Structures are given as structure tokens and as C-alpha cells.
Subunit: 409 residues, 2 copies
């Protein structure tokens, strides 16, 4: 059949350079393997290559070797068109449902294979989309079920780089859709950023932002250094799981998880990623930063490279906002469950294999009520999605949530 791909960077801003660098690197890799541009849909905000802070204008790199990955990348869905609605329409292969962009969709045949790679921010049961948009896991599984029931493909592999990414599939990803999935982390772990300024590796000194994400560069660097007609999906999973665990030091590493149809792990990777004829032969611990910590570290290094007062006030406003969100969520737990009980209810993690939330529509409603009183969650705010899921699961009503949010903000 035909190999298709959908590559998505869910973030924007120079601070999040790495998410678009990861996506651009994946695009170059797929082209080198023989996938056609018409079958690869790229979602990237596209604010990085020409950003005023970029020391290499018109260039994007994804590791300290400094090879450009931006040239030739198509502008399928960029800027305001990087939405959950467009992503869903693209996967479904329905041009009439897309708003803006190039109109390129995955109008695939039953014999085709599809590869999906997402890189950015996330939280329990959710993924980020640029400018404070939230993509809920069950809406993504719903699209996969719809695409499967319309005979849209033979098999699909999905790689997801985001905090608590295992929570997007645990207890909800069906095994009967011919879809195999791997995530950068389990349901309760953050994901890690690599190639940061001041670290070994050792990135080009002119860079003030991190170049890549740990799980993302593990799979890509593995793919481009092996013959994909010989390497299996399983071999890639194992090598990525080992590299992302960072010598099993989970204080600076994460648990790569797998979901869906594990029979697909026996397949050769070239059926999804293509084969690079140059790689026809062939078969240290990394300093990493927490995804949620990269923004503050970027601003701090910006501050130190002139230590100026505008930057220090920007850091204070960022921390004050995070403290407001953290404090409001904590306070809601107190008002609903009582002191001493609020924290165990909001922070308890369900056993692996169980869905984050029993009612996904209730989860969206709790977020809506919260934001209507306490303000937008923003990408950082996605870390509190398990608290909202736990409020839903506890049987607390939406009227009580309204009252608690009103008292809290």
C-alpha cells in the first residue's frame, strides 16, 4: 500500500523550539525513507525558523550536530490552523471538515499504513495545542475508532511525546483497531527535554533554548542509524525505552509505555517509516530538564545573559501565575473534601490499566467551570487534569464545583 504520516507539534513560542525541531526532524527522516510529501501532513505553529531570537535564521536543528531540518518542510497546518479540529479532520481524511491550511488530509485506503508522531506539552488525559488549546484523549481515541470503522488503513503506529502521556491510552485505547502506540512516559510521570544550554551532550553555544525532547530524539536517532527493513517496531520500542529511562534513573528519566495492538511490534519499521538506502548496513547518561521547567530555565538564562529588569518581572509573573493555579486547585480540594482529604482525593493516581476518568464529558465541564472563575489553565495548567478527573470520579456535582470555584476565585 501507501505509507502516510501525521506529525504534530502541540506548542508555540521560542521557549518550545524543541517541539517543532522534533517534528521537522521526523519529516526529514520520513522523506529520506521514501515517504512522499503528499502523504505527510505537518502541523507546526511555524514561529521558530524566523523568530527574532533564532541565531540561525531560517534554520532549525534537533541535536548538537547542527544539521538543518527546516528546509523543505511543508506548511500544511500552521499558525491559527494548528487545532484539534483540523488534526481530527486530517486523520479522518475529510477535506470538507478542515478549516484553513493546505487541505492535505489522510485520505488513505484499506491497504495503507499510517504513522503519527506528536511532540509537546501534556497532562493527565490531555495534550496541548497552540495558544492554550486542550485536546482530550477520548476525542483522539474516538477519531481512531471512526477511522478504523471507515476502513481507512491496514495498520497504524503512534508515538507520543508529552507529560503523563501514558494516561492518554491507559484503560481507553482499544486493542482491536490495528493501532500500536508508544508514549514517552507512564500515566504519572513528566517527560524530559534534552540538548539544553549548559549541558553535555554540548549544543552550539549560541542557542538559548533546548533543541529536542528525550523520547523524540531517542526514536529518531535510533531510526536514522539502523536499516529499517531489518529493525522491528519492538527493537525500536526497546531501544527508546532504555534510552528514555536514562540508566533506569527515573529521577531524570521516564517509563516508555506501549498500548494497543502489540502484534504490530513484530513488523519491520520500514512498513511505517520507510527505508533509507544509505542505512542499508549497520544493525552515556544525558543531562535532562523537566518539560514544565524548561520555560523558567529559558527566561533565567535570558536574564543571566544581561544580569534585564523586564525579564526578572516576566519570571515573577510566570511563577505567580503557576502559584495561582496550584493554589486555586488545592483550595478547591479543601472546599469540596475538607482539609487533609482534599490533597489525597485530587492527587491519587488510579491503578495502571484503569481510565483516568469515567466520564470525559464531565472532565471537560469541570475544566470549563474552573476556567470561568479561576482563568485559563494555560499549558502549565494541564498538570492539574488528574485533579479535575478525580473530582468527576468522586461523584461531586457540577453545582458544587461552581460553588467551590466561586469561593476560591
Amino acid at each position: 500500500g501507501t505509507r502516510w504520516a501525521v506529525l504534530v507539534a502541540g506548542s508555540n513560542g521560542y521557549e518550545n523550539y524543541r517541539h517543532q525541531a522534533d517534528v521537522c526532524h521526523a519529516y526529514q527522516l520520513l522523506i529520506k525513507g521514501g515517504l512522499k510529501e503528499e502523504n505527510i501532513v505537518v502541523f507546526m505553529y511555524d514561529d521558530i525558523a524566523w523568530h527574532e531570537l533564532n541565531p540561525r535564521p531560517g534554520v532549525i536543528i534537533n541535536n548538537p550536530r547542527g544539521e538543518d531540518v527546516y528546509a523543505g518542510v511543508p506548511k500544511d497546518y500552521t499558525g491559527e490552523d494548528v487545532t484539534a479540529e483540523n488534526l481530527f479532520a486530517v486523520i479522518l481524511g475529510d477535506r470538507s471538515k478542515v478549516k484553513g491550511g493546505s487541505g492535505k488530509v489522510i485520505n488513505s485506503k484499506p491497504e495503507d499504513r499510517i504513522f503519527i508522531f506528536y511532540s509537546n506539552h501534556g497532562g493527565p488525559g490531555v495534550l496541548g495545542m497552540p495558544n492554550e488549546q486542550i485536546l482530550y484523549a477520548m476525542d483522539f481515541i474516538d477519531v481512531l475508532k471512526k477511522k478504523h470503522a471507515s476502513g481507512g488503513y491496514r495498520e497504524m503506529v503512534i508515538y507520543v511525546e508529552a507529560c503523563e502521556s501514558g494516561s492518554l491510552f491507559e484503560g481507553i485505547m482499544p486493542k482491536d483497531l490495528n493501532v500500536f502506540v508508544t508514549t514517552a512516559s507512564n500515566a504519572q510521570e513528566n517527560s524530559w527535554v534534552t540538548y539544553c544550554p549548559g549541558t553535555e551532550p554540548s549544543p552550539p553555544p549560541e542557542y538559548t533554548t533546548c533543541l529536542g525532547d528525550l523520547y523524540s530524539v531517542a526514536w529518531m536517532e535510533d531510526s536514522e542509524s539502523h536499516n529499517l527493513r531489518r529493525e522491528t517496531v519492538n527493537q525500536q520500542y526497546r531501544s527508546v525505552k532504555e534510552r528514555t529511562s536514562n540508566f533506569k534513573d527515573y529521577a531524570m528519566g521516564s517509563h516508555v509505555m506501549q498500548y494497543g495492538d502489540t502484534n504490530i511490534t513484530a513488523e519491520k519499521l520500514y512498513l511505517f517509516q520507510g527505508f533509507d538506502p544509505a542505512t542499508v548496513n549497520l544493525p552515556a547518561k544525558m543531562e535532562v530538564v523537566h518539560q514544565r521547567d524548561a520555560e523558567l530555565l529559558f527566561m533565567w538564562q535570558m536574564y543571566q545573559r544581561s544580569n534585564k529588569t523586564h525579564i526578572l518581572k516576566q519570571i515573577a509573573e510566570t511563577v505567580k501565575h503557576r502559584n495561582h493555579l496550584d493554589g486555586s486547585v488545592e483550595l478547591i480540594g479543601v472546599l469540596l473534601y475538607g482539609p487533609g482529604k482534599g490533597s489525597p482525593v485530587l492527587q491519587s493516581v488510579r491503578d495502571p490499566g484503569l481510565p483516568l476518568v469515567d466520564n470525559w464529558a464531565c472532565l471537560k465541564s469541570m475544566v470549563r467551570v474552573f476556567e470561568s472563575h479561576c482563568g485559563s489553565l494555560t499549558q502549565y495548567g494541564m498538570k492539574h487534569m488528574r485533579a479535575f478527573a478525580n473530582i468527576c470520579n468522586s461523584g461531586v456535582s457540577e453545582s458544587s464545583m461552581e460553588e467551590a470555584c466561586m469561593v476560591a476565585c
Copy 2:
């Protein structure tokens, strides 16, 4: 010689009933042992016995057996006269330095023994005094040295019930002053509250506030159930250490610590606490609450006993204030040390045996700068004293602290 005592409750408000109950119980115990009222100085705000919330007006109890401990307690230093300045003057035995109160002081002779018991709130290197007053550990050790150099006593025993109370003596309490000290906790642990509503024990149901504190009721109930001509200071320390550890479950118990002159542990307790001729014969796990958590639990139970809107708003204002203090301190760490470094610097605990802070005058100055921009610390705020001590120890200047506090608030 003569036995003297100084009993101090460092808090006020009905929520803190237990601190004055502990002190009143200690007073009754000392009288039963033959200590004279003229030699016992009592510091209690005195807002509990006749509080509008008290279900037994004019009565105070310190355990579920319900025996009154208020009747006969002298009003030496009450209300506005419960200050660090008056406490210091009383210990020094200088009537001319006291402001207000009865004028009773420890004008002791070189052959005399003194027993000091403090109960309330605390933080690293500090003790509370009523209405947001802070008593610094080195000022207390300074008074002990002055009293020792003036030949004020033969020996002294001090019992201190407060969070992180071990930090008041670690690395600073001299062993050459004929003073032996025990604390409810080590330098990095909170202290525990007992006889709380809804717990077993099983307090009288009409009570909405906790009756006693764990270390305090351990020593008092031990003293009143033994012959003190036979029991040693060491035997009391061991029994209190065992009871306060709560079956070595330090998630609901603490490490009772000892400082000063350990030769005093060989002495019979009656040399300090007297002997009750009624106790001439003779030789389960407790549900406990964190000292800092008692206030919110009290308000919540007040709320549930009418679940009303005024109480819920009061809970929100309390939590918002604690979140403001926690957030401001965290933000100052970020501004001074950078993200990722702020928290390890502010929260690192020195090895046991080392003083909390190298310069105590700098500690007072950091608190002064902080409160001038971020507002009063309040008793809860004492938990952040290690952060202030760590700023001093790091060599950060007062001008830089001023700048960080200004940006943060």
C-alpha cells in the same frame, strides 16, 4: 533549695485551646508536687476559659477524662503581657525589666532548681508568642547564659513542645550551663496534636477544638502516674520519646530530642517537678493531627456543624494567605538562585549538630525585609524560617533580598 517553674503557652485563639490546656495541666501538676505558687510563673493569653465557643465556661481540660485544670492558675502574664521581652525578664529574675503583669519573676538563688515548659507553635530556630510575635532561639540561649553567669540556679530542665523544636538548640545550646533540654521533635519535623474531635482516644463530644499536644500530654500523664522521688529525668525522656514516636510511625509521630547537660538525666524528677504523696506507689497508637493542620480542621468541623457561608469564606481566606506566603518564599528562591536551584537552597536541611543559621542578626533582618514587602509571616509563616536562614547562610546580601522581595510583592 527551692523549685521554680516558668510555664508558657505561645499562642492564642480558641483553635489553639490545647496550648493553654497543656500549660494549665503543668501548673496543677507542679502544685500537687509541692512547688509553691510564688515560684511558678504562668504565661497564658487567657482567652480560652471564658471564650464564647467554650462549652464548659470557666473550665479548661487537657484530656478526655475531663478534669478541670483552669481553677487556681495565676494570671501572671496574660493578654498583651505574653511577650518575649517579659519571658526573658522573668527568667533573668529582674522585676525592673518586666512590663505589665503581676511582676512575679524567677529571682532564684544558686542552690535552686528551675523547670521551664513551653507549648505552641514554632518553626526552624523560632518559637511563637501571641499575636504574630516571633521568639528567636539564640535570644533564648543568650538569656540562659546570662542567668547562668549571674549564679541564678544550680540546675535547670526545659521541655519544649513546638514544630521543628530541635532546631532551637542544635549546634547552639551549650553543655556547660547546668541545663538539660528536651524537644517534641527533631530540627526538621512538625509536632503533633492529640485528643482531637472525631478521634479515639475519644474526647467529650461537645468539644470542637483539640485538647492537648502529644509530647506535652506524654510527659504530664507520665509524671502524674509515677512516684517522682523514684523516676529519673532519663526514664521520663525515654517514656516520652517512645509515646511521641507513636509506635515508631514517624508519618504520625516525632523524634524527641535532648540537648545540653545530659548528666542531669540521672537526677530524680522530684528535684524539678516535686513529689505528689498520692503517687507514692506505682513505678495504644494515637490518632494525631499536625500542629499546622489543626486550624483548618477546626474551621472545617465548625463548617460541618451547620453545612455557614461566612465560615467557608474564612477557610478560603486562610488557605489563600498560606498560599501567598508559600508562593512568595518560593518566588524569592527563584529570583535569588534561579529555577531548579531556589528550592534545594531554601529547603536543604543542615546535618544534625550544626546551627540553623550562622548569623542570627542576619536572620532577623531577612524576616524584617520579607515582612516589609510580603506582609506579616503569622504563626503559619514560621515554617519558612529555614528558607530565611538558608538565604543568610548562602552569603546573599540584604540589598539583593530587598530587590527579590520587591519583585515578588
